[PDB]
Design a protein around this ligand. Sequence first.
Ligand SMILES: [Zn+2]
Ligand SMILES: [Zn+2]
Lengths: 146, 146, 310, 310, 310, 310
Amino acid sequence: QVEAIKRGTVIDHIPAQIGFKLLSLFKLTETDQRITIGLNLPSGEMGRKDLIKIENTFLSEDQVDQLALYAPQATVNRIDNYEVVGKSRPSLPERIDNVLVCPNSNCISHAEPVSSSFAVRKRANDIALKCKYCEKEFSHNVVLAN
Amino acid sequence: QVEAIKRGTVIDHIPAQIGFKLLSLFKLTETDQRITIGLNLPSGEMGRKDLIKIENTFLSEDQVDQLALYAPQATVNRIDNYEVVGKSRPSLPERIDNVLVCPNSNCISHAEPVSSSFAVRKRANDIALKCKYCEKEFSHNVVLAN
Amino acid sequence: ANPLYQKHIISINDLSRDDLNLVLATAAKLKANPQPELLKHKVIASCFFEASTRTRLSFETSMHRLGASVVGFSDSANTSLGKKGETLADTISVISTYVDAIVMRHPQEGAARLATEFSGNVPVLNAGDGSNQHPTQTLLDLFTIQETQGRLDNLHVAMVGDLKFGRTVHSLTQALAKFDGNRFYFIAPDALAMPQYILDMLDEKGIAWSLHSSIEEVMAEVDILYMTRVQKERLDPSEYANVKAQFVLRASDLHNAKANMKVLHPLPRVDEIATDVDKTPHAWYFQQAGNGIFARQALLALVLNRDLVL
Amino acid sequence: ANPLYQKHIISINDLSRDDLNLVLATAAKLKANPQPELLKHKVIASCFFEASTRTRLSFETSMHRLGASVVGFSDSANTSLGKKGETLADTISVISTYVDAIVMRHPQEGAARLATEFSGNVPVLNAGDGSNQHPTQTLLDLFTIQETQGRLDNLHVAMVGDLKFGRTVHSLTQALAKFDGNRFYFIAPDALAMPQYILDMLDEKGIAWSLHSSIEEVMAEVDILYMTRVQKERLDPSEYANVKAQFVLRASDLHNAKANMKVLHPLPRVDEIATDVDKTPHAWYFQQAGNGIFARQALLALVLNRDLVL
Amino acid sequence: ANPLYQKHIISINDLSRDDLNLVLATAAKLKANPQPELLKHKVIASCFFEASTRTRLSFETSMHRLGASVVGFSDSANTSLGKKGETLADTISVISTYVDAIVMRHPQEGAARLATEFSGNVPVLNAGDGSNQHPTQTLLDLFTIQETQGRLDNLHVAMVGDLKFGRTVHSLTQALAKFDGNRFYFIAPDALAMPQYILDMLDEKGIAWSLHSSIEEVMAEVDILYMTRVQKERLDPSEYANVKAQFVLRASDLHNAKANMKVLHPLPRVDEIATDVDKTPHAWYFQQAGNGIFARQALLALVLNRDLVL
Amino acid sequence: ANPLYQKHIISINDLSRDDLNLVLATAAKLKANPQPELLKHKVIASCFFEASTRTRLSFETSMHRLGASVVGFSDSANTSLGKKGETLADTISVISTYVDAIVMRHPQEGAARLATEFSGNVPVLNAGDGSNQHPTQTLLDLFTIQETQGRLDNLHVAMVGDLKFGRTVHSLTQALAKFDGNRFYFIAPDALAMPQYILDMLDEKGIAWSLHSSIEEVMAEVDILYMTRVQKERLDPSEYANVKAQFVLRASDLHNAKANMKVLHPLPRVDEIATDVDKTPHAWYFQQAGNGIFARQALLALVLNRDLVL
Ligand SMILES: [Zn+2]
Ligand SMILES: [Zn+2]
């Protein structure tokens, strides 16, 4: 809720000490304009969670489901036209591109100009993530160390 | 000048598209409390430069001269006791530890548990930076690609 | 247009039952009436970044029995390309301009899959990445259990050996799991048994399977007996010898065996199948290897042809 | 009779402008309408006494696209012949009896030239001696700057890299110096610059040339940008890094570049041309490599044919 | 006469508790007041038929700190002796005539035991046969858990890693099983767990032991934490990564740990113990390695002395 | 306390003139009256991670002439330690516990400097990292130009050869630049000349220097003539031969030479100094090499002694 510009895409409620990381992996700083980075505050349904708005951008529906294995619950409520006209919240996508690294040491993706791509599975119980290239299904907690 | 908490260390006026980088190299997110990250605004003696305050921290005089080869000019004016009681601005240090990588491919510092350390030289004209380990003096623009 | 024209055949679970059925039926066919100058004038690359000459001599005869020309290499850390620093991506980018189909084996996984991203229109046949796929072997394993059992369904099929790291038996199970009925018997040392993600898969499509200690309790029920080597280093010098002999197959054991029953082995064997089995009519590993010609021909013809006229 | 029938093509300054023109015009042609069984029944030797598989796979496909057969070798200190003590002269003396054309790469210089003295009627194509000639590369470099610029004259052509030891840029300059106008821009580290016997030659035929510090001052004037690697050992660990980045070409720099302008590279690159250039329409090194087929075909056809019927 | 004079020290279960107690007590002693010219004038052979320089530099300093001279070899398939055809028996038969004590590591098992049959009066210290004994390591592992815990009995001692093939943890258990009380905790991947002949032995002398999934459930009870590497090839590329991190020890985990508690590792580590543990006072692997000097000195002095005067 | 006790001697610009003066004066001394059992009972490590036997046999005799014991290794990709994955930091951490001084040569730069961070109290002598320091050579080069010229100041000293990559002449200039007067003459091929950061340094302390094409224009003015090899690959096959002979020194040229004048060479030579120079009294490279014993002894004694009693 802290001081921020009218109009942009608001990203909110990021969990415990993520947020810098999300600005790191999805490369949100490359595409400039005012990047109201909140961070390390108390916020909604928490009272100790990270959050941050931007101006002029407009992340897609697939662009927001990318957050899914990092936050799940996290508002991304657009401040369209003049004000907060369009709520959202990520679920879990069908394919996480770039960002994560294959834990198989002998994968060709450590040696190449290729985009890292894991097909997502298990809606919850222990989200499994198989590599596009070496076809190995590891746990998500395992790929998420990086 | 934007909305931020009374008391902390204010870091200001960071140059063109640095700022995320400074939060990356000096590891300013590890030590939590409210990290008012400004970024991509108009500010002092600029009208298009980055900047960001924090709460509860208090960077040292050597901690601030670390910025030197990244900003030079950049206020770091403490909001002590209750309010803005102690101005500063980095010059260029005598030794930049960690952060930068030796461009010599055959240095042992790419293979090891050792802290990267370059002795600084030339106050201006073409700041040279020799390695601690392989004793090679490269230009700063060359090490600064990383 | 063929269903496989221009397709890169990289995995066995990349394929569907219906084109596995189109690969097999075609093989049966080219075996019947050969097409010697079908691929006449096409130039194919035998890129074995990882040497393996038994897969190479097979593939390369298969190109030739269809009249194609072959250029290529067996690398053993000395081939200038895709070595000094030149990325495997940039090697495929220049091979893809003078050949018509790449054949490829490599040490790292997803290598062929990477090739697919830079070959453009050129099809890539995967002769085996690393620990991952070798679908051409599986396409000659199924062509052989069907040429002999007359069907790929409702069969009893044993799986003997190092079933944990045995990628050849992993992928024969997934492909046979696209068909109905089919019983499975896994005979393996306690410590090298079938990985439980396959067993998980087997249960969701409701496939029947058991676990056994020896070929002694399996032999009268068994149609196929797919044999595979148990490595000395994978067990323990002592644990190896106590259990070892339950996994050897001499012909003594071929007593209760059904008449149809075939003993298949991916090769090379060493000693887990004995020379007195070779005389017995249930030994079919040498013929299994010969049919690899027919299964690999079929991929080459479907992949480089729209109008397949046979 | 062809002007090149039975000729051994060993150097680029062994050739004259008019048959360089006959090599190029023929290549353009075979590319247009292929002649698949032109060299049908001829047997050609791929003698790579020095392994190099990117030159070998190119040459060998080129023989095959004309229907010829290939016998040969990649030696890596193990080939019985031309090794134990048997002179390279006496190796050629027995190869020359069963083949129809030798293709040859070797570590020492004038090797192919020596072969010419013992092959008799057999033509010798030189796939690269040592530090000296590799005319087949140059014949595919000119075929590519002309397929794209529409002419081999009055062009601006940059030369980036290790220009001292860079034999590939040496010999592209001498061949382009047989044509008119043609400006030259040499961008090189202070210490690896263009040897001054070439610069001497360039001045006697009155050819225009400059010297630059970076591709930054050259880019809007340039038609071709022939790129080549600067080796780490040739400079000094520190001197390497200070100057290094002026010789890298990312696509950022392709801003002022003319529409025609082509970025060519002999390959293999490593990092002096970046992956964001590959997308840009000025990147033509992968096609440069593909055309090597067409230039090498042409030599094989002219050399083994009198009546070239295309 | 010493109880160990002229003895060949080949196994750890070749020794009895009372001379294990005589090895340890002596080490504590020579560490206290060094005896620099004790073995003055004796000549000792460092026969490392299998290279291993960390065991060799240790052994060889130990000979020297007692004033002995050393002749020897690190073979890497090139040492003329005990190679071409000369039996390891006949190599020992000629070394045994000019030295006073042989030190020996070899690839095959029972090599040192074979040496014992041909050395005659010469003692043989076994620096490690193959998959079998390396008692000098165990004699420095016990000297270190006792120099720090003040006793070799009624201790809690964890065993982390590849416990199946981990010969160093096999033999630390058998030697600690000659003492009383002593609890054991084995943390291991499902597939590389402690072999059940040791667990059998542990039950007959009535020794207490558990089995755990991680150092997470063990840390507040533990005195020693003997760490050892889990090899990538022993598990499965995926099964390796899922379980991997439970066997890594960063200093984060050293929170509940008792004050006495020592983290020991046989070395070389790679990554299963992290650099932030090295600062923590529970890290004792570097000192464990330093004490190997003291334990190996002791064998050399007892074996070559009757009247040990310290 | 000595000014060098416990010091790690890693660079030549790590030292100051006054202890360079303490190294030299001590060497002159131990040469005079040897101290055979000075380092009696100390154990020193000869860690040559990079083989080099001429530096090793020198260092190792030097330890021994002072009565010390030596343990160590010449690695050629086979030494178990500091190889498989064990960090060079963690190798030094276990060597540092059983030796008293490490001697160390390695392929990568700052290796010895890294050792210094993990050896603790143990001194590290740097036998040469990579392209960076080898101060022990320089400490025997200065000990020799002073044993013969009677002073390290106001001398004429020539520097012949590959002066760009020639680290041995780099560091002889910096050390001689701490003394007064001293003229410098650099004779070098156009392309391998003295790097201009040294020439920069030479101008700030106001040191006199020239640049020459041959030893022909230098010979009557010269006191020292420090010779060094010009590598064939560093120039150009032709550029090598045209200039080559100006850098060879046969005795023909020793005609104008002063009586004092000494021809020194770091070794190994090949052909740039001819065998008829060896007879002439100006040849002092073999004695230069012999004195390396005396300079390296001195570091070992100062570093391992407080009270140096000579
Ligand atoms: Zn992968
Ligand atoms: Zn460095």
